[PDB]
Ligand binder design. Structure first.
Ligand SMILES: O=c1[nH]c(=O)c2nc[nH]c2[nH]1
Length: 240
């Protein structure tokens, strides 16, 4: 297959692979920020994703108020505009649901998860350049899935028949990402992402580990997400 010159090639190949897939009830709507938030997504890939990296963080899929708005993984609006310096054109997905509107950089909801993750990175590293010198953050699946009533559907809850071709496409993009960036360690943010990384990357010369996911759905994340993750990283051998 084609040579992957960079992350943007990889994301474009992924979007193409995704565009051929079908999803059905209870999926009613599928959002692909790789298409509607392409300019800010490619900004993030091009400004911060130059190879090599030592460590790759991998999330699961966009939150409605983060990457679905900005094109950036865990991409809370404020942190993407203020810290990363990215603020660009975001159009609305085909069939946008009214309970999950894509206002882009005008979105006024703050995503907790990405606020916590990027805020901790900002606190530990100061500038983006000190972080991205060694690290990167990507999602395994760039799509957001909703029911007809606008409810989120995580990719683990898709019917197997539709899940398998989705995961095949996402695994291929992940392997391509790892061959380009050459990290020593790939870290799933949460259990689902961790399990996909072990599945996709077996036999590569990389270690795979996990950190706690920053969402309020975990008690430890509310008490001390940063201290917890900082411990996990240290147990993995990762300097943060
Ligand atoms: O890009 C993202 N990936 C994730 O897994 C996630 N979880 C919450 N918010 C998120 N953003």
């Amino acid at each position: 297959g084609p040579h992957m010159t960079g992350l943007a090639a990889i994301s474009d190949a992924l979007a193409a692979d995704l565009a051929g897939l079908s999803f059905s009830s209870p999926v009613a709507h599928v959002y692909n920020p790789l298409l509607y938030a392409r300019e800010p997504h490619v900004a993030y890939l091009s400004r911060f994703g130059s190879p090599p990296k030592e460590v790759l963080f991998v999330g699961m899929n966009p939150g409605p108020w983060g990457m679905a708005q900005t094109g950036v993984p865990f991409g809370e609006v404020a942190v993407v505009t203020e810290w990363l310096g990215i603020n660009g054109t975001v159009t609305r997905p085909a069939g946008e649901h009214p309970k999950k509107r894509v206002d882009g950089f005008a979105c006024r909801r703050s995503e907790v998860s990405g606020r916590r993750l990027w805020g901790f990175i900002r606190e530990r590293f100061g500038t983006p350049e000190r972080f991205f010198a060694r690290f990167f953050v990507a999602n395994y699946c760039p799509l957001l899935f909703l029911t007809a009533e606008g409810g989120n559907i995580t990719p683990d809850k898709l019917r197997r028949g539709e899940q398998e071709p989705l995961f095949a496409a996402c695994d291929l993009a992940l392997r391509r990402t790892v061959v380009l960036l050459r990290p020593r360690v790939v870290i799933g943010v949460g259990a689902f992402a961790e399990a996909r990384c072990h599945e996709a990357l077996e036999g590569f010369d990389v270690e795979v580990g996990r950190i706690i996911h920053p969402s309020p759905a975990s008690p430890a994340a509310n008490r001390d997400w940063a201290g917890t993750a900082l411990r996990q990283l240290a147990e993995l051998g990762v300097d943060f």
